[PDB]
Design a protein around this ligand. Sequence first.
Ligand code: HEM
Ligand SMILES: CCCCC[C@H](O)/C=C/C=C/CCCCCCCC(=O)O
Length: 467
Amino acid sequence: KPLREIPGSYGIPFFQPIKDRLEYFYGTGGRDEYFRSRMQKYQSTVFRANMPPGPFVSSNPKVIVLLDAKSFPILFDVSKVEKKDLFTGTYMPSTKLTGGYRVLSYLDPSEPRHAQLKNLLFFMLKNSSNRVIPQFETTYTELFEGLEAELAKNGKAAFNDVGEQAAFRFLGRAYFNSNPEETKLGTSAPTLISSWVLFNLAPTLDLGLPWFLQEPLLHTFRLPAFLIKSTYNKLYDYFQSVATPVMEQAEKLGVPKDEAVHNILFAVCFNTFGGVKILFPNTLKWIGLAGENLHTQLAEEIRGAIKSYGDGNVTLEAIEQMPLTKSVVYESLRIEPPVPPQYGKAKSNFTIESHDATFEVKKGEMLFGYQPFATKDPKVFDRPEEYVPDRFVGDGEALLKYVWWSNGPETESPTVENKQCAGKDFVVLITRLFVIELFRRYDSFEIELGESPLGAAVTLTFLKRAS
Ligand code: HEM
Ligand SMILES: CCCCC[C@H](O)/C=C/C=C/CCCCCCCC(=O)O
């Protein structure tokens, strides 16, 4: 693997970043093609490139693209890449959209508040790791139920919207033993959250709207924060009066209540919610398309393990007796990473390598990985583009080191020293509980997709039951 100069150009300083941007957003093939075609052009899985949002919202579009499993890892190595204000990318949503504070996600582990706010989050999870399983069944048994009636009523039932309401219902319930739909928020949190997240991510979001609408309105400037302000407080009011326990630990940690509430609100609405809004529909999708031997076996495993080890109910012991169910949730996480882009700014002059070359990285350069590609490396995973349910079963467990949806080997856990998903163990559980509940009710199901910028736009059409 010879030392080579990283291929790719940045072109003229203003025109290029804009032109590429348009390519990234409207070129036939989507952003996936933006990378694949460059991978092909330079016969390299590591190359130079501009990345949105470019122009006025971003002052530095220049990055180095990582597309292979060999190089991609450097991004986890916090000893070499910095993780300051790049949670999104080459731009950071105005702080006005987050209480004036720079929330946890944007902090480098070398920042005291990082370890502080992360522990605060570790408390919120642990301190609620007892309502998770109970409160989950309760919320999705509301959901499937609600979906069952809507099905027989008109033939089909959309999953996405309802699923999000349940998601936020389940989060409040567990994290704070609260049903938000019993407060002023009503069943209208998913909308508040979207409206708010849109303001933040607007510069790098493709809503599938005409380029002559998206470019002027969403991709050249930042949206006036004052507009969202009203909506943001509606969510702020909720968290402030329900996150009491967690709001106290924040003081015990040296963090003010106000700043804490803004970080809690972010973690629950942006991190948690934003992620499940995507992962669940896709997981329900990949399984759905798997056929029936999966369904029949998934329902078989879950129930058997529920009797044998759960005594007639879901428990951590029983889950550990669901090898297929575990692998399934992992595969979903491998085949379609809910949060694709990982960034890292080089702190020193070091070297990295692809499957067939080496490259010099200089202090100050931004490294960018497109995970969906890296986790689909044929040199690592067989029939990569396929969803193999039992891929991580048996000796497959040894590949977990390669599942990076949480910004790090699935075989590792989040710490204050790293930038790995704080709710890592949390999502793996609830995504299993998701699949677990599903088949603990249905012997099988069928579904038809639909396109959307979110991902699946799933609608159910059939639902065999137990008994
Ligand atoms: C399945 C849903 C979720 C997905 C896909 C997801 C994904 C991610 C990713 C990719 C990062 C890395 C960002 C970076 O580049 O620096 C991240 C960070 C983070 N996530 Fe999540 N996440 C999910 C759920 C959650 C939940 C439920 C929590 C709540 C406790 C959470 C808390 C965090 C925190 C606190 C960080 C930053 C930690 C740090 O500063 O080191 N995430 N998440
Ligand atoms: C490439 C951006 C990655 C963001 C990862 C983050 O976890 C996402 C959070 C929420 C995403 C969904 C936000 C709404 C997307 C649809 C457009 C806005 C809306 O109407 O909801």
